[PDB]
Design a protein around this ligand. Structure first.
Ligand SMILES: Cc1ncc(COP(=O)(O)O)c(/C=N/[C@H]2[C@@H](O)[C@@H](C)O[C@H](OP(=O)(O)OP(=O)(O)OC[C@H]3O[C@@H](n4cc(C)c(=O)[nH]c4=O)C[C@@H]3O)[C@@H]2O)c1O
Ligand SMILES: Cc1ncc(COP(=O)(O)O)c(/C=N/[C@H]2[C@@H](O)[C@@H](C)O[C@H](OP(=O)(O)OP(=O)(O)OC[C@H]3O[C@@H](n4cc(C)c(=O)[nH]c4=O)C[C@@H]3O)[C@@H]2O)c1O
Ligand SMILES: [Cl-]
Ligand code: NA
Lengths: 361, 362
């Protein structure tokens, strides 16, 4: 079977250095908040063009912490795309803020900036942008609304490592940014991992303390914090792979281009890349989505849906189930992700295209 | 020749070849989260604690936070807890919008004084969190009775007390649910952050598994508003390797602690004589001249750490508790200092600690 995402193929490239670094860490006797974390932070901050990177435990923790650090009041509002992955929302509700869900543009799969302002109220305190599937969101009007209404901009960068907008990288487009380095991310760890990026010295220092039980200095707790740290081992593996991240994204770009140039099937709506797209996911759209996934599985092609139930329709968010979000709803009914990975072989991506072209429904 | 407080390199060096072997196994698998290593570790740790269910999670604070979250308590519900525990025990309560009710310890065990608990029970009380502090199991008998009398949950914080035994059961199996840290300095320590939740209750275990996986029990679906709190395959594997030697290692710590208890004799030092089973995560001595003694031991090339010098109610993050009068707690925090102990600690190292203490005239 062709895997959706063959992480062994992706990581095998680095095994020798993974084992060297692991042995270096064993020799150091230091496994938490050490030289590897510092090195990776400094390199990832450089990569994103930001002053400060704080290694944390995962992408949801990254968001949760950013919101926490802003000390919003219970029920304050955070504008967010309605079609993002549920963890973007969980971060908001975990802080007892209210998610205000906005429809995406069908031609980007990202928040439609034109639909935000109408939803801003006295309680709105932040906009969470999500660079979904790999494509950076059009920030122009979002930044204008943030300045106009005194809103924080929070970036969810879990799916768009390295994507660029004008002169900047995702991670440097708002006030603070959360990354996942979950193993399937464009920069993936060998375990759970994440980070927070910002230019604000004071916010950075708060965040560090907050992710370390609320302790800035040994023995002392300035805040009621969490334990959300990036392990030395994972920092070291990330730093190894970071050197190849733009290359790996360019290998995705190549595959996505092959798909775009070769899949010709009237039942399939292909993704476009209006702005920079690092192609974490290659998302097609069809009225016969389940049929297509079954067909592809018959042809030994593994696929995953991102995503078939939207946050507002989840059982955990019963109070949202009534919201009318037909664009988001229709997307969740229609999308399927095609295998794409930096290391994916030409014969595999050729086969995917050929089998999709043969789909006659 | 500086004696390190806890020489983890020396603790872990015994397992290096095994660690590397398993790491390469995991690379071969291409599975790094929620895999075979986690399942295997959980199964073994559950057997070790004598419980039905072990759920690996990201760290010990998360473990406690998830337990409390799983019980779905009302805002401002009360959780009885020792006043002298590590702050993380409290953070787990307040993060869940519950109210901690701080109970003085017994001066001679450093654990919650069970005889002070009932007077603080109210209609809002939902649970007692017991903490097995420093490695000493709490005297659970009265605590379990009380919990039954008032229909309260017992939550164990087992971060410092891996493998200790109260009568016929292990820590982990002494309440309704138990949180463990496997922070690297723990008696069973990982090589990064790690924890677990132990319980006998099937529904509680499944609910915890979902709550630690975004709230998701089934791919694509979220039953609860959860969090991401998982035990990496690599840390599970490392923990499984060391779990085979944990009872041996704990008994080695007992040997060294009993050396200290029997060989240190100084009128300025109160030794931690144990009233119940103790696995000696920390060996805590107590003196009126604590800062003086730490400087004395540093001068003699012996590194110590304090557990702890500021109690939770006096921290800046808990300004609304700073007023509470907890004199036993406050006194302990002024007077405690931890001595180096470990299962690999060299004879000449512990003998030097004892001798240098015996020489201290203050
Ligand atoms: C009762 C109770 N409940 C819940 C919790 C929360 O559990 P966690 O969320 O898993 O931390 C704790 C945690 N309790 C721990 C932790 O929260 C920890 C960070 O702080 C204290 O422990 P301590 O002050 O001894 O920790 P440390 O960082 O100084 O490490 C101990 C020694 O080991 C050495 N070392 C350490 C590291 C990390 C290394 O890589 N290499 C190395 O050689 C350095 C030190 O000499 C607490 O007692 C607790 O005690
Ligand atoms: C927009 C946004 N914001 C915040 C977050 C929260 O970030 P975290 O808290 O770090 O997860 C996410 C996470 N987003 C991710 C994650 O939450 C993740 C668990 O679930 C989805 O991703 P997906 O359905 O693709 O994940 P998956 O587990 O199926 O793995 C992808 C593939 O990789 C293969 N695999 C996976 C693993 C773990 C392995 O060891 N070996 C292996 O071969 C199996 C699959 O074929 C989400 O899109 C997000 O998309
Ligand atoms: Cl067919
Ligand atoms: Na972790």
């Amino acid at each position: 079977h062709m895997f959706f995402l063959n992480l062994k193929q992706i990581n095998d490239r680095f095994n020798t250095e993974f084992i060297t670094k692991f042995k270096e860490i064993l020799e150091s006797g230091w496994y938490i908040l050490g030289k590897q974390c510092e090195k990776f932070e400094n390199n990832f901050a450089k990569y994103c063009g930001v002053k400060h990177c704080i290694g944390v435990a995962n992408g949801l923790d990254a968001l949760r912490l950013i919101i926490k650090a802003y000390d919003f009041k219970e029920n304050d509002e955070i504008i967010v795309p309605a079609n993002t992955y549920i963890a973007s929302i969980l971060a908001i509700t975990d802080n007892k803020c209210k998610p205000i869900l906005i429809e995406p543009d069908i031609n980007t799969y990202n928040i439609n900036p034109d639909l935000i302002e109408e939803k801003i109220t006295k309680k709105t305190k932040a906009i969470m942008v999500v660079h979904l599937y790999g494509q950076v969101c059009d920030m122009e009007k979002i930044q204008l609304l943030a300045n106009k209404y005194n809103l924080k901009i929070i970036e969810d960068c879990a799916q768009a490592h390295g994507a660029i907008y004008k002169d900047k990288r995702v991670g440097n487009l708002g006030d603070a940014a959360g990354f996942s380095f979950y193993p399937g991310a464009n920069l993936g760890a060998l375990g759970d991992a994440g980070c927070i990026c910002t230019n604000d010295d004071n916010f950075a220092s708060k965040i560090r303390a907050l992710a370390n039980y609320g302790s800035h200095k040994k023995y002392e707790n300035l805040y009621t914090g969490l334990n959300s740290r990036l392990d030395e081992i994972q920092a070291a593996f990330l730093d190894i792979k970071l050197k190849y991240l733009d290359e790996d994204n360019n290998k995705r770009k190549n595959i996505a281009n092959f798909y775009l140039q070769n899949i010709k099937n009237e039942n399939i709506i292909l993704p476009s890349n209006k702005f920079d797209h690092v192609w974490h996911l290659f998302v097609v759209k069809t009225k016969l989505r389940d049929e297509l996934q079954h067909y592809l599985n018959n042809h030994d092609i593994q696929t995953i849906i991102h995503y078939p139930i939207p946050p507002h329709k989840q059982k955990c968010y019963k109070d949202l189930n009534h919201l009318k979000l037909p664009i988001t709803e229709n997307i969740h009914q229609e999308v399927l992700s095609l295998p794409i990975s930096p290391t994916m072989k030409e014969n595999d991506f050729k086969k995917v295209a050929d089998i999709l072209n043969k789909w006659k429904v």
